[PDB]
Amino acid sequence: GHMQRIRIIDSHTGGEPTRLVIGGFPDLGQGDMAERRRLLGERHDAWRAACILEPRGSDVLVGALLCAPVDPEACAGVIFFNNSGYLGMCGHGTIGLVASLAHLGRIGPGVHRIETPVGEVEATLHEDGSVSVRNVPAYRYRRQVSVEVPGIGRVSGDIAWGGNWFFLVAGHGQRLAGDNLDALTAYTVAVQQALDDQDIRGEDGGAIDHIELFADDPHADSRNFVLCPGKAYDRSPCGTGTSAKLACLAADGKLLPGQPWRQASVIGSQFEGRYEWLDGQPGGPIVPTIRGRAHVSAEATLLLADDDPFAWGIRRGS
């Protein structure tokens, strides 16, 4: 043999794919997840590309690299990435990761600590196979921020953190449906770039790379559309995005602690959200818990031949 290998297990959460890498990536040291993410992106980005871009993957694909945690007492460490770069936390991805570990027979129902580049999360694998993820603290940074978006006009929304930075657009007037994707993508893409061009960032200077829209749903508290940093949309209601929404609802008294919130995605998938205050302190950031279900959909070994010009995927221009 001679081709290089990447051992993976795929799963999807409400249709949103997660490619868990359980072997094959370069050594990233012993530092914390944030430090390993730095090294991964700076010296070994080729592996992200080979893993999730064509021909072996696609732009919709989200990847998750399994790492040995710093704290030997934690269950695992993980780094999430997408078609354009790296993520902080990943809701559907953590649910997918937990479902995959269980499928691999490495864990059973229970509470599992997972270290991520933005903090440790706690995932509970239920007897029914679904997974509840107690995410890192979430909060609304700025409220009702108005932005002049080319091709759309004035748009306003909240800027909140839920494991990644999100811009929750208020009154977009768009039809959130599976048959209206091109419009929803074009709309959010315009907003995403406007925020970037006008240098509107998160509290830490981070780029607001996720744009989500919300609307009523006849069979859920709300329905949403989430544009990811690589311009692909999330098939799931997005855990960090729903966490950010929970933080906003919580700040405006629209949802009480412990109360359930059913979030449906643009294609029908559903997550159940809930929250408590960070350290029981009302009015500040919340500790959101997102519950959902993933299904393992494939186990595979990606093969990278030395003479394959696309061994590191088809990385397109611009």
UniProtKB/Swiss-Prot annotation:
Native organism: Pseudomonas aeruginosa (strain ATCC 15692 / DSM 22644 / CIP 104116 / JCM 14847 / LMG 12228 / 1C / PRS 101 / PAO1)
Keywords for this protein: Isomerase
N-terminal signal peptide: none
A GO term, aspect molecular function: 4-hydroxyproline epimerase activity
One Pfam family this sequence matches: Pro_racemase
Name of the protein in its database record: 4-hydroxyproline 2-epimerase
UniProt similarity note: Belongs to the proline racemase family.
Role this protein plays: Allows intracellular utilization of 4-hydroxyproline, one of the major constituents of host collagen, by converting trans-4-hydroxy-L-proline (t4LHyp) to cis-4-hydroxy-D-proline (c4DHyp), which can be further metabolized by intracellular 4-hydroxy-D-proline oxidases. Strong B-cell mitogen. Plays an important role in the regulation of intra- and extracellular amino acid pools, allowing the bacterium to profit from host precursors and enzymatic pathways. Cannot use L-proline, trans-3-hydroxy-L-proline (t3LHyp) and pyrrolidone-5-carboxylate (P5C) as substrate.
Induction: Is up-regulated when the bacterium is grown on t4LHyp or t3LHyp as sole carbon source.
Activity modulation comment: Inhibited by iodoacetate, iodoacetamide and by high amounts (10 mM) of pyrrole-2-carboxylate (PYC). Not inhibited by PYC at 1 mM.
Enzyme class (EC, first level): isomerase
